[model samples]
Target: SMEQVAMELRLTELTRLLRSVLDQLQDKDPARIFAQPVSLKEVPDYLDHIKHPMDFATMRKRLEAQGYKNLHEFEEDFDLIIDNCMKYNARDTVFYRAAVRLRDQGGVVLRQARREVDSIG
Candidate 1:
């Protein structure tokens, strides 16, 4: 039950992250930012590629297995990771800042999940 609840909450939080990131990007000029064509089709893939430390295929499988089956989930986790990474590292100029924000939030979600599990037992 805890895992189920955590998965659902993680999914919802991740969706929020995706929306926030997309809203931010929609306001900016993609060509100017990334020096490339950034259609809706390409943006998700591009974000995934940038956010992942591993190869695209491997990262994709890991995400899917972890319940990141949709754009919202993927975006959320990606944004959180990117954001936290920026706080410690100096490499801030990248394509998936929003994704990093989501990843940073994900850490919070994970902590919450752990607490929830501990309380049940």
Candidate 2:
């Protein structure tokens, strides 16, 4: 139950981050626009679309081909987007959770990577 709650919270955070980033991009590049008040429910589907250019697949090869090799890459890209948001986009408390979630995920990825490297050597 706790894990599920955590997951939902993480998703909410990501939703906020995406909204913030998009808003910032909109301001910087007037041609690039985003809807007001980004929806949390849309995060998973959006992520899925980006991570799987074609469609959902069980195989890692197909997923990787779409550009998501691991959580680290995803987190890195998220951070970059958020960084741009902070610099150019207007801040909103409602969307700050996404940055927090990305930070949490990044930590998880770093720990996992460290463990894998440790096991190798």
Clashes of 1: 17
Residue range 1-121, candidate 1, lDDT tens digits: 8999987876666545444444444334233332223343744554544443322233344444545545545545444444434543454545456435444545565455445434642
lDDT of 2 by residue, 13-38 (tens): 54444334323333442322222323
Candidate 2 clash pair list? 13-97, 13-98
Candidate 1: segments with Cα more than 4 A from true spot: 30-121
Ten-residue segment with the worst summed lDDT in candidate 2? 52-61
Task: For model 2, state the Cα shift of residue 56 in Å.
Answer: 14
What local distance difference test score does each model get? Answer: 0.45, 0.40
TM-score of each: 0.27, 0.31
For residue 33, what is the lDDT in candidate 2?
20
